[PDB]
Design brief:
This is part of a larger assembly, with seven protein chains of seven kinds.
Chain D: E1 2-4, H1 7-14, E2 21-27, E3 32-38, E4 43-49, H2 52-60, E5 66-69
Chain F: H1 2-12, E1 14-17, H2 19-28, E2 33-37, H3 42-55, E3 59-62, H4 66-73, E4 81-86
Parallel strand pairs in F: 2-3
Antiparallel strand pairs in F: 1-4, 2-4
Chain G: H1 12-16, E1 18-27, E2 36-42, E3 49-55, E4 65-69, E5 79-81, E6 90-92, E7 112-118, E8 123-127, E9 133-137, E10 141-144, H2 160-170
Antiparallel strand pairs in G: 1-2, 1-4, 2-3, 5-10, 6-7, 6-10, 7-8, 8-9
Classes of the chains: A alpha+beta (118), B alpha+beta (91), C mainly alpha (49), D alpha/beta (76), E mainly alpha (84), F alpha+beta (95), G mainly beta (191).
Bound molecules: zinc ion (2 copies).
One zinc ion binds at residues 44, 46-47, 49, 80-81, 83-84 of chain A.
Chain A binds three RNA strands through strand 1 and strand 2.
PDB class: ribosome
Keywords: biogenesis, pre-60S, 5S RNP
Entry title: Chaetomium thermophilum pre-60S State 5 - pre-5S rotation - L1 inward - composite structure
Chain lengths: 118, 91, 49, 76, 84, 95, 191
RNA sequence: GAAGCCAGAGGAAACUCUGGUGGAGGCUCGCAGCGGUUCUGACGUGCAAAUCGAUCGUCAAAUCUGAGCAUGGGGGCGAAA
RNA sequence: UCGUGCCCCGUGUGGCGAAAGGGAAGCCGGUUAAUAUUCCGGCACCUGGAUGUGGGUUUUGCGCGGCAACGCAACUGAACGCGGAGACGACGGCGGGGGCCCCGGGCAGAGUUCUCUUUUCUUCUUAACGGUCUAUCACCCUGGAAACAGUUUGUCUGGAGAU
RNA sequence: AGGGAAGUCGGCAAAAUAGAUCCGUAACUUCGGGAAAAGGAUUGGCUCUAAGGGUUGGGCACGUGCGUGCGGUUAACAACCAACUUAGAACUGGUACGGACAGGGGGAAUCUGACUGUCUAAUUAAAACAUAGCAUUGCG
């Protein structure tokens, strides 16, 4: 039995675009099959973790699949992870509350200064 | 079980480069490959990433430090005199 | 409490058992539809009309 | 190629306009029968147990759809 | 062969807005409206106006590209320029 | 002073150690004191102060780190924040 | 190397108040012994953010707010004009003239000491890492602290490969053959 | 068989000893590759305007190598012959 | 409509340069004297465009479910912005998968057979493209751990929440 | 054959050594090495023995194949499956046992260059060059 194979294209060099895997055909022969590179999982923009629920594809493969497959039904879904979204929400609320508090204290200090001047 | 009497981490160099140079490089190698306690999360997971770059594995914080140690004594004395100068300027 | 390997094997065995029951019930509903195929064809005809 | 597990869906597929032809494959070793309909994009296969009602499904299939039985040898 | 790009064929080539028609003919708005009335250039409606222009609204006027091409050869344009 | 009071509270009264149990005590409203370490993350610290402000609970900012807070509690692990539910025989609440 | 290590251009915000930026990354720059800091500022005139590249001082970290301007605080990583700092402070990336975005005290472990002020003509006397004394305009900017990565040269290179790897990215000539090892046609010291 | 780690035996502790684990080094034997030390070697109008045989150096890197590109004689390039 | 104008924006500047870098998409069987992932048959895929049918949404106008990680055939989205992918070193051991190698049984065929050998050898295969059920990391919920625990060949992880 | 460097400018060339298991291994030393130092014992075949593994499987009381409330750590037991190493013993052939192939001669010193590396393609590979380390000069 012939178990040795050849490249099926004219590139003879083992580059990153020249990945092959061995298959057996219904004709009983061993053969190579040229395969594309593995897709990379999309990652969070804040912490850099892999985003769960999102497929790992080559960049132009994402144009052929629908919107709910490419995203998670949440704010920043498919771009940020849930922990980072929670941190963003809590940070935004607390900073706006402290902005209101600082504005109130500045108004009180301005009123006290005006009363001292008058 | 102690395997080498004195070379320690410098035993990878064998008999090359001289005893004095091996002793000089040993301290820098030890202090650059040691683990350090993080000043942000408190865990012992700060390791050198590059030249003067120290990253914590747990809290993912990256700090600018010395070449082979996290903090330089000159930088610490600088922080102390900066704190007292800032206190003098504000007061 | 921490479970035992026998309990894990029992859980697994129930999992393939319920998968096999789902497959058998799908075969049964396909056979029933094949039995009532003529009424199905008439209903498809009615919907298209 | 796509497999249809619903007789109603297979009936609608056979009544689609792009259904050019249909064929019946008999596997007596497995004791099964297969209805394969050739549409524009997909070949749709319905797999049934070999039975008289599976044979009578031909009568429910549309008349204008040219249906043929698969021979034992695929002569070129 | 070479893969086509989006938005380079179909309704985008078939229609243009009034602003694009005016800029193509290099006319003022009164002259453009006068020429359209005199030559019988009628407003049109694409099936999807976003495929023609992403900033189109319900009040956006569309014309045929071939109609504007026909308007490009009208001798009254030089009459307008001579009068100016 | 604060370390001795914390140690006697550990010996006599009731505490919970950690962020989630401290939040649970603040939500229950039975928390009598909250201690937050110096090296606590600022977002977590602000959230704990907001919870204590809503629950009317005093907050002590421990000048040590989480390691030193755990050591002052007498445990062999770090502790970013803690909640004292029962003062016991100490006067840590009267301050 | 992606971008040169420069300050922001001297604008209205740095000239009259301060502007806050956030340190996103601390990165290794090939050929340079000192780490760089990516700091993102706000554009006062448009919606888009502006990313800058500074020489990271020791103690800077990701997620830290730094402040650049006349009214910025005296804190490590803050960029201040030299007229706003007291005597005895050490600064980094000192501008020779106000607006050249940093020229002095840039290598690892190095700093410039503010010796004194002369407010009559707006001059500042500074001490360079070489021990030289210089007089600069007081509106020249500097980042408070010491450049990170000090003690780099205390470690022996110990290997020709390590010297080669050092100099290959720095494009300096290596190996170096001696002039006395040459022929008289090649070097004045030849022979 | 370097750091790091585990266990046992001592030491008030730092450390000491023993048995393992681990897999570092411009470390080492050595195949291919690259190179070219020796032989009264072959060959000497040769297979060859530098080849052949045995032997040898090196073999995880200051290792070997393709394509594209840059440096041009008053020059270039040169671990410098 | 004072009808022959007004408003918005800043980022710059073009081309060439890789049959080994990046990159949208094709597999199997057969066929010639000589070509074949190119021809023939079957079965697919990508890109772009136009416009229908079914289904979906909507009288609470632009979906519903799950505490959550998230899921489901759909489920509006211009300017202006943010992020991810493309997109990346060398070496060491460990684990999973395909292919190959090896062992046993069986059908069929071939060889050996002075003697022995229920013997030796050969065929026993399943592509792209899809459906469906599962696969280390990681993440979520409960709960709060010293008599510390879990854990890898390699000692890392845990009140910043482990088992 | 015998002798064993008596040959020759010169042990040039050849011969001898060689794998693996075990015993053992000096001076000097930058303590890392030297070191496979040196010097020794053994190796075939056959018939056995021993050691080193994996998978599955626990009794009651109720509701009804799962849910609780208990009870027990001799499963320290059974059933099935599985592959390659290591050690020990007897017997037996012998002129040979790493039976071909494959495969360090070793040691005492001196000079010399620190080492790894590089060059005179086509007569010179080296104490030459480079190297790390050290020292000096110039430049804000
Ligand atoms: Zn995130
Ligand atoms: Zn940390």
């Amino acid at each position: 039995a012939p178990t040795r194979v050849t490249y099926r294209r004219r590139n003879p060099y083992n580059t990153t675009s020249n990945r092959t895997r061995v298959i057996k055909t219904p004709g009983g022969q061993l053969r190579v099959l040229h395969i594309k590179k593995r897709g990379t999982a999309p990652k969070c923009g804040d912490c850099g973790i892999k985003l769960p629920g999102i497929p790992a594809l080559r960049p132009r493969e994402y144009a052929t699949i629908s919107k709910p497959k490419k995203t998670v039904q949440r704010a920043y879904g498919g771009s940020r992870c849930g922990n980072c979204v929670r941190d963003r929400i809590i940070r935004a609320f607390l900073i706006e509350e402290q902005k209101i508090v600082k504005k109130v204290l500045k108004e009180q200090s301005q009123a006290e200064k005006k009363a001292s001047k008058k | 079980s102690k395997r080498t009497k004195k070379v320690g981490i410098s035993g990878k160099y064998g008999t090359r480069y001289g005893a004095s140079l091996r002793k000089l490089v040993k301290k820098q190698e030890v202090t650059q490959h040691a683990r350090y306690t993080c000043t942000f999360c408190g865990k012992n997971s700060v390791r050198r990433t590059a030249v003067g770059i120290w990253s914590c594995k747990s809290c993912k914080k990256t700090m600018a430090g010395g070449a082979y140690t996290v903090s330089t004594p000159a930088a610490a004395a600088m922080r102390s005199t900066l704190r007292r100068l800032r206190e003098i300027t504000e007061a | 409490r921490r479970k035992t390997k026998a309990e894990r094997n029992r859980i697994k065995r129930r999992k393939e058992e319920e998968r096999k029951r789902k497959h058998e019930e799908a075969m049964k509903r396909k056979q029933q539809q094949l039995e009532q195929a003529k009424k199905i064809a008439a209903e498809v005809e009615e919907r298209e009309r | 190629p796509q497999e249809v597990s619903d007789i109603k869906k297979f009936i609608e597929i056979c009544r689609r306009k792009d259904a050019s032809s249909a064929r019946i494959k008999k596997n007596p070793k497995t004791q099964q029968i297969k209805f394969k309909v050739r549409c524009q994009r997909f070949l749709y296969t319905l797999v049934l147990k070999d039975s008289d009602k599976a044979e009578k499904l031909k009568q429910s299939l549309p008349p204008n759809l040219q249906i043929k039985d698969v021979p034992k040898r695929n002569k070129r | 062969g070479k893969a086509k790009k989006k938005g380079k064929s179909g309704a985008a080539r078939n229609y243009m807005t009034r602003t694009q028609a005016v800029k193509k003919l290099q006319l003022s708005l009164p002259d453009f409206r006068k020429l359209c009335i005199w030559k019988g250039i009628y407003p049109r409606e694409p099936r999807d106006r976003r495929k023609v222009n992403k900033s189109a609204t319900a009040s956006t006027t569309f014309y045929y590209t071939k109609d504007i091409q026909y308007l490009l050869h009208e001798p009254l344009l030089q009459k307008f320029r001579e009068q100016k | 002073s604060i370390g001795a009071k914390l140690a006697l509270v550990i010996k006599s009264g009731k505490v919970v150690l950690g962020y989630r149990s401290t939040l649970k005590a603040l939500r229950s409203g039975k928390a009598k004191l909250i201690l937050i370490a110096a090296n606590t993350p600022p977002l977590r610290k602000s959230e704990l102060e907001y919870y204590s402000m809503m629950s009317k609970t005093p907050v002590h900012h421990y000048s040590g780190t989480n390691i030193e807070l755990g050591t002052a509690c007498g445990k062999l692990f770090r502790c970013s924040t803690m909640a004292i539910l029962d003062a016991g025989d100490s006067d840590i609440l009267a301050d | 190397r992606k971008a040169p290590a420069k300050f922001r251009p001297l604008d209205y915000a740095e000239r009259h108040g301060y502007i806050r930026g956030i340190v996103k990354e601390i990165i290794h720059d090939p050929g340079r012994g000192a780490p760089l800091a990516r700091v993102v500022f706000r554009s006062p005139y448009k919606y888009k953010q502006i990313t800058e590249t500074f020489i990271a001082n020791e103690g800077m970290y990701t997620g830290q707010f730094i402040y650049a301007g006349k009214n910025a605080a005296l804190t490590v990583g803050n960029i201040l004009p030299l007229s706003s700092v007291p005597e005895g402070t050490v600064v980094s990336n000192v501008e020779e003239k106000p607006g050249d975005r940093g020229a002095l005290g840039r290598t690892s472990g190095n700093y410039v000491t503010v010796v004194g002020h002369n407010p009559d003509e707006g001059k500042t006397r500074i001490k360079l890492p070489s021990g030289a004394k210089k007089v600069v305009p007081s509106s020249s900017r500097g980042m408070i602290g010491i450049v990170a990565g000090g003690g780099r040269t205390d470690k022996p290179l110990l290997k020709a490969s390590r010297a080669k790897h050092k100099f290959a990215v720095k494009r300096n000539r290596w190996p170096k053959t001696r002039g006395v090892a040459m022929n008289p046609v090649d070097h004045p010291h030849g022979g």
